[PDB]
Design a protein around this ligand. Structure first.
Ligand SMILES: NC(=O)c1ccc[n+]([C@@H]2O[C@H](COP(=O)([O-])OP(=O)(O)OC[C@H]3O[C@@H](n4cnc5c(N)ncnc54)[C@H](O)[C@@H]3O)[C@@H](O)[C@H]2O)c1
Ligand SMILES: NC(=O)c1ccc[n+]([C@@H]2O[C@H](COP(=O)([O-])OP(=O)(O)OC[C@H]3O[C@@H](n4cnc5c(N)ncnc54)[C@H](O)[C@@H]3O)[C@@H](O)[C@H]2O)c1
Ligand SMILES: NC(=O)c1ccc[n+]([C@@H]2O[C@H](COP(=O)([O-])OP(=O)(O)OC[C@H]3O[C@@H](n4cnc5c(N)ncnc54)[C@H](O)[C@@H]3O)[C@@H](O)[C@H]2O)c1
Ligand SMILES: NC(=O)c1ccc[n+]([C@@H]2O[C@H](COP(=O)([O-])OP(=O)(O)OC[C@H]3O[C@@H](n4cnc5c(N)ncnc54)[C@H](O)[C@@H]3O)[C@@H](O)[C@H]2O)c1
Ligand SMILES: CCc1cc(O)c(Oc2cccnc2C)cc1F
Ligand SMILES: CCc1cc(O)c(Oc2cccnc2C)cc1F
Ligand SMILES: CCc1cc(O)c(Oc2cccnc2C)cc1F
Ligand SMILES: CCc1cc(O)c(Oc2cccnc2C)cc1F
Lengths: 257, 257, 257, 257
């Protein structure tokens, strides 16, 4: 496959519905060797199974809120892999209040700090911590959402962080690209995943896009996973600092009229 | 003038070179009644003079890092003004390292947190704290920079925060617009101000834009001030959620070739 | 007012509902001296009345499809005015089929050619033809629509031309800006005007934006007019190559969900 | 490969340096069956050789300026292929004057009409003409340039048409997407090809981007070709209405400072 010999660290694989699960299947399929992270001791067993399913014995803890774990993630990885060709950042969080109802109502300095810390800062933080071992055709990929570009009901504080995240893709690409390292994002259309629970009326968004996207259908983690593999691969070697919509075209229309 | 009877609170007036100084002159000129904030007891005397020059006796402390001061700002303002028609947010900060040299080199969780806290979170925080007294044609305005849209040397962490800030304009506009309140940003071209010191090779940017902008000239705080007054006024009553470039057109070209 | 002594040529004033009618009122109000164009001998009497109402005796024919009339417009104008400080381009046309139903169905090379000829090419054509008499702080303004940015039902071929139109603003701004001439566009929200008749289900769009814009209300020609005056004035002297949304913020949201 | 069994019509293969040559190599490599077009009888022999090299005996004339040839292209294609899974539109033209020096200087109604006719209208024209035989996972791809987004020296009139072209991708995607057909564009960075001759100081652009792109290097037709294959393939099944930058990240930065 077009990822033969590529060694790719994936984060955010929490369930088989996860976007990262999709990216993993697509990568493994194309010849990639994978490793995975998890948050807390209580998820260690699940990700070990997941990693086994992709033929991997490489799982490592990493609460991205904690500098020590970030630094130790690559300290550990270093002992198994010589270098890294791919980093998937499929992580986010915002306090429930902050992604529910009115934007101002769920706004506190703490909520803001947390959403940005976890969803935005973590991407270039991992990149910095990975830099020593990154190869010269290495490739970083994060996940964004249209809520960064335009205001979307309930997405609120998360929208702001996603804006910062997408800017981080551009600054990262300039900072790492001299080393041959590419940095990109996929702005995925809505997918029913665990994190999607914290979005009030996700179902409404889901129906709206199935009704209004140009392809008249929602995207699957297989579709996003396929695009991710591409971006992670040398097929996308001319592509960096890009935010790629994989949302059946929804971003490009004014629907509902 | 087209701001007769409008009561406008301005922040970030630090010197006569400040962007907020420009906005104040333009507003006062158009009939507006002004009030101003400052950071710390040691700047109290300077802003009192400044306010005097605009015929105002209304100065209030506000380190936007501190919830208590934010809440007390409008508590104080309430005792003088019944309501507020205009809020200027002309505030930012990033640790010097974080806006110097390579993006990753100046990156720490703390730097990130601070830049975003001060430059991004503060705009909707002030809006939330102002909400009780805001009028029904009230108008909020913040200042952004092109570095939010594309990667610009040295702007680094500040670029990310400005992205979040611009997203905050859009979410703010949806949250406040039912009340008739408009929210906008001006993305100003480079102006030699005090904060511009912390930008390595500001002079290079300044020369580049004077050479490459369509109008072949840099913008002045008078030009930005004039645009701000407009946005703050009922002339811009159909305009909200907008990021307006006032940069002699620089954003719209690919210069240097 | 902030347009004292400015001499501004307006096009596209067809009725009192026209966007150009709004711009004219706002301009005249601010101290501007106006002149107007019309299409065909059979509209000569109506625009002469309109011009009278703005205290002007300056009406000139111009079907922008015809080179001769364009060239003769400024030949005539030259005999009355020494120079021109403002040009309003509030003109568009597309064959009815091309702005109705499915995009491909109403598509013919001729429809395409016509929509682009009239709605796009005419703006820089008039600019070229006006160049000799343009002053050194002169200002050109055209009208666009969100359909240029994203696909909107029925807007079809017109969306493509508007995209070209907005690009023309940018190239115009680089071409004219060394002479100190600014070029901008307003992307107005939907307004019931005569040209809006040719849009199937304009009423649906109108209801949608009143329900979904951040300000929850449609824009008036007074609101657009006010913004146009600003852009035409020296208040906007730092602003060129800009496409300014005056649409109650509609562009910035994903509504309907 | 990931294009096994896909039948793809390519246009614009003029030399081995052509962007379409790159796309063809990548497609053939991935298991695609190809066909090609050419302009005029005097290029028939060259494209027949080219097609041979990709193991194809399918060459067809098509000056996209002519309705008859467009209609006859798919009339002919129908006799060999039952249906079409991929259409590559790698075509453009503008009169030399219109892409040289000052924008206004090279501007005539005719130059405008021609550039738009050939570079913009032809894409949805071919799509309309192909519609009858298009499959249910078919995929259309055109080539754009950054000059559509921002003003670039010398690119002039071509910039306007490219803007219209990119809009066409969006309207096409809504029009064809209910049939399951995806439409996308690649905005490629500068590549020394035959058409690049008509760009004054192409060499200056080329040096600028090699010096200023995040990856510090120019893109090859292999890199664009690889991306095109992806977009044409079912790997990109969740992607439509997208304009994908393959330019080593150049679009995303403000270089030269
Ligand atoms: N679900 C959608 O519709 C959708 C659409 C567009 C983008 N996204 C984005 O896709 C990405 C992946 O989320 P998902 O939808 O696949 O849902 P998910 O619940 O499967 O994945 C979220 C992951 O974030 C991880 N996470 C949260 N806090 C963390 C921390 N402090 N440290 C490390 N990891 C942490 C969780 O462990 C989890 O695995 C997110 O960035 C999300 O914002 C999701
Ligand atoms: N100078 C430029 O070239 C330029 C260009 C585009 C945008 N901007 C933006 O314009 C805005 C105004 O900055 P300026 O250029 O006029 O420079 P400035 O130094 O005059 O103003 C900066 C202000 O930020 C205030 N500030 C910093 N930390 C604060 C805090 N914790 N609480 C309250 N206030 C705080 C300072 O007191 C100061 O008045 C900023 O948001 C800046 O990012 C500046
Ligand atoms: N009403 C809306 O919602 C809306 C929204 C966005 C942009 N616009 C734009 O505003 C302008 C006019 O809109 P309107 O709603 O006021 O419609 P309108 O019909 O009232 O005005 C358009 C004018 O263009 C004129 N015109 C047509 N063909 C011409 C030609 N060959 N030469 C010269 N003039 C010609 C018309 O006669 C009329 O004078 C156009 O730029 C249009 O694209 C309108
Ligand atoms: N080289 C670059 O830097 C660059 C960058 C961005 C986009 N593009 C685009 O890629 C495509 C081709 O670029 P190129 O550099 O390979 O140049 P090219 O000359 O090698 O290829 C262009 C093709 O269009 C053909 N063509 C011209 N007029 C035609 C007509 N009336 N009907 C059918 N075909 C016609 C040409 O003959 C040629 O086959 C175009 O879409 C062009 O706009 C090129
Ligand atoms: C509405 C589409 C969507 C976007 C996300 O970024 C997303 O991921 C989130 C959302 C809120 C909090 N945390 C995460 C990871 C989930 C979603 F369902
Ligand atoms: C380079 C142009 C520019 C942009 C700013 O946001 C700016 O304001 C800054 C920059 C860095 C840190 N803090 C502030 C307020 C100063 C500038 F000079
Ligand atoms: C749907 C909003 C809208 C946009 C226009 O450009 C407009 O002006 C047009 C539209 C179609 C053809 N011609 C003109 C002048 C009218 C409108 F109602
Ligand atoms: C400057 C980059 C560039 C863009 C093109 O669309 C391009 O293709 C063109 C350009 C002008 C006219 N015709 C074509 C096909 C060539 C180029 F070199």
């Amino acid at each position: 496959g077009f990822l033969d010999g590529k060694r790719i660290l994936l984060t955010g694989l929490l369930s088989n519905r996860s976007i990262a699960y999709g990216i993993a299947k697509a990568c493994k399929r194309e010849g990639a060797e994978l490793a995975f992270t998890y948050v807390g001791d209580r998820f260690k067993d699940r990700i070990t199974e997941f990693a086994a399913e992709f033929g991997s014995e490489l799982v490592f803890p990493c609460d991205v809120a904690d500098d020590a774990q970030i630094d130790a993630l690559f300290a550990s990885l270093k002992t198994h892999w010589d270098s890294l060709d791919g980093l998937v950042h499929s992580i986010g969080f915002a306090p429930r209040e902050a992604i529910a109802g009115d934007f101002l109502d769920g706004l506190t300095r703490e909520n803001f700090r947390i959403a940005h810390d976890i969803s935005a800062y973590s991407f270039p933080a991992l990149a910095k911590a990975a830099l020593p071992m990154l190869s010269d055709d290495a490739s970083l990929l994060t996940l964004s959402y249209l809520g960064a570009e335009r205001a979307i009901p309930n997405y609120n504080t998360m929208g702001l962080a996603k804006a910062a995240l997408e800017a981080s893709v551009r600054y990262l690409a300039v900072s790492l690209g001299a080393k041959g390292v590419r940095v990109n994002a996929i702005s995925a259309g809505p997918i029913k995943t665990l994190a999607a629970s914290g979005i009030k009326s996700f179902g409404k968004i889901l129906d709206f896009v199935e009704s209004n996207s140009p392809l008249k259908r929602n995207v699957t983690i297989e579709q996003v996973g396929n695009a991710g593999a591409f971006l992670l691969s040398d097929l996308a070697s001319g592509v960096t600092a890009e935010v790629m919509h994989v949302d059946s075209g929804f971003n490009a229309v004014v629907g509902g009229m």
